[PDB]
Amino acid sequence: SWRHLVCYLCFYGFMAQIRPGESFITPYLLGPDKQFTREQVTNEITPVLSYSYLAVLVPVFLLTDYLRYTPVLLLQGLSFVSVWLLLLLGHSVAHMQLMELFYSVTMAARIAYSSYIFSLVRPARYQRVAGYSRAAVLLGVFTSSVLGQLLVTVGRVSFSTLNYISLAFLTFSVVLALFLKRPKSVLARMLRELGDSLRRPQLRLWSLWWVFNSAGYYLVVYYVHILWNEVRVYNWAADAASTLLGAITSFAAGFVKIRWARWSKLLIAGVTATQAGLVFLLAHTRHPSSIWLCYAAFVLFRGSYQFLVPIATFQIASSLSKELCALVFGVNTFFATIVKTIITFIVSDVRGLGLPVRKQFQLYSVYFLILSIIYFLGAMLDGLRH
């Protein structure tokens, strides 16, 4: 385990996210292999995934820490394999509903890897291993996107062949996850430990940052895709560049050392203000010069969030007394997706404050603005008390 414990963990994190046929699921559904109407792929496939992400997250984060994270990784891998198998068969609508349910299972179990890395190493190099793991995962996502687009656009393969390749890669990822090691009123004690951990000043700040900034980033990304498709070839290039910059920034965050608990609220406020500025710049671009300045901006935005994705996790592991690193990650992810759903309902739904995409992004930038003057006014409040 001297050389094949963190290196192997990063390698598995890289290989588990290689699904070259991931981003091409919708065209495959709408393609000639499966005769699906535009209306169904969007009204019977996306809502089920959206709801099941909320539904299946709770059991996953409740049981991942007791299961010691190897069974949850195996479940995520087998669920990815079942997703692609169901994609290959795809007999009817219910098959694809089950596929989306399993995909939501995978997205819910994504937290098990981020807890496994911390439960696998001594509580001294949490930050370095967090940076390594996030760099590996984001590099895997970037490689998956680039491989899919290279095979489809500059290569010559069908969607079925791409899905076969993705299924083979997912089988290999399951094989890799098999060899991973397993670290060596229960609910009442669980919640008591969660509350006592939340009483700490370092877990609480980064948990709030997760719940809010992660929700903001997810909203911004999920609607940046739609905004770019609204106002084609370079879209995947921008996505891959953003993911690669995210991997680089996660590596840098793993390798950065600053005196935390003092320059931590200030760092969060600065990063959130930078992200707010980037989103404001992204929204305020209607001139023809909207293929260089905005794309890159979004890239930076993604990287910015990733620059705080391995630190926050690390700052949750360094401030946890029990083996509840998975519980806090799961609760934070669940609350972040709850906040994202609430924001979507309040800004995107017609019944609520229904606004178009432009004003939607004007709201998201302002949402980050309220999220960058709260942490700004949190680094001087505690400074005053000193």
> Was 302 annotated as part of a binding site?
yes
If one asks whether residue 283 binds ligand MTX (CB under 6 A), the answer comes out as: no
Spell out the alpha helix ranges (H) of the chain. 6-16, 25-30, 38-43, 46-67, 70-89, 93-120, 126-149, 159-178, 186-198, 201-209, 215-230, 233-255, 265-283, 293-307, 309-317, 325-347, 357-373, 381-385
Q: Which stretch binds ligand MTX (CB under 6 A): 17-25, 171-179, 194-202, 230-238?
A: 17-25
Q: Which residue among 6, 18, 25, 269 contacts ligand MTX (CB under 6 A)? A: 25
CA–CA distance, 233 with 238 (Å, rounded to integer):
9
> Was 316 annotated as part of a binding site?
no
Q: Which stretch binds ligand MTX (CB under 6 A): 20-28, 196-204, 284-292, 324-332?
A: 20-28
**Residues contacting residue 335 through CB under 8 Å, at least 6 positions apart:** 211
Please say which residue, 27 or 155, places its beta carbon nearer to ligand MTX: 27
CA nearest neighbour of 55 among 299, 341, 361: 341
**90-111 burial code (b ≥16 CB/10 A, e <16):** beeeeebbebbbbbbbbbbbbb
CA–CA distance, 57 with 193 (Å, rounded to integer):
20
Q: Shortest approach of ligand MTX to residue 190 CB, angstroms?
A: 25
Size of the site for ligand MTX (CB under 6 A): 14
If one asks whether residue 266 binds ligand MTX (CB under 6 A), the answer comes out as: no
Q: Name the 3-class secondary structure at 13.
A: helix
Site string for ligand MTX, 214-233 (x = CB under 6 A): -------x------------
Q: Name the 3-class secondary structure at 106.
A: helix
Query: Which residues, numbered 107-136, are part of the site for ligand MTX (CB under 6 A)?
Result: 110
Q: Which stretch binds ligand MTX (CB under 6 A): 21-29, 120-128, 270-278, 326-334?
A: 21-29
Q: Which residue among 141, 165, 299, 326 contacts ligand MTX (CB under 6 A)? A: 141
Q: Name the 3-class secondary structure at 32.
A: coil
If one asks whether residue 45 binds ligand MTX (CB under 6 A), the answer comes out as: yes
If one asks whether residue 49 binds ligand MTX (CB under 6 A), the answer comes out as: yes
Q: How far is CA 116 from CA 107, 110, 126, 253, 313, in A?
A: 15, 10, 11, 19, 11
Query: Which residues, numbered 50-109, are part of the site for ligand MTX (CB under 6 A)?
Result: 100, 103
Q: Which residue among 26, 97, 171, 341 contacts ligand MTX (CB under 6 A)? A: 26
**Residues contacting residue 87 through CB under 8 Å, at least 6 positions apart:** 21, 25, 28, 96, 99, 163
Q: Which residues are annotated as a binding site?
A: 25-26, 100, 110-111, 114, 126, 134, 141, 217-218, 222, 250, 302, 306, 310, 313, 322, 325, 329
Binding site for ligand MTX (CB under 6 A): 17, 22-23, 25-26, 29, 45, 49, 100, 103, 110, 137, 141, 221
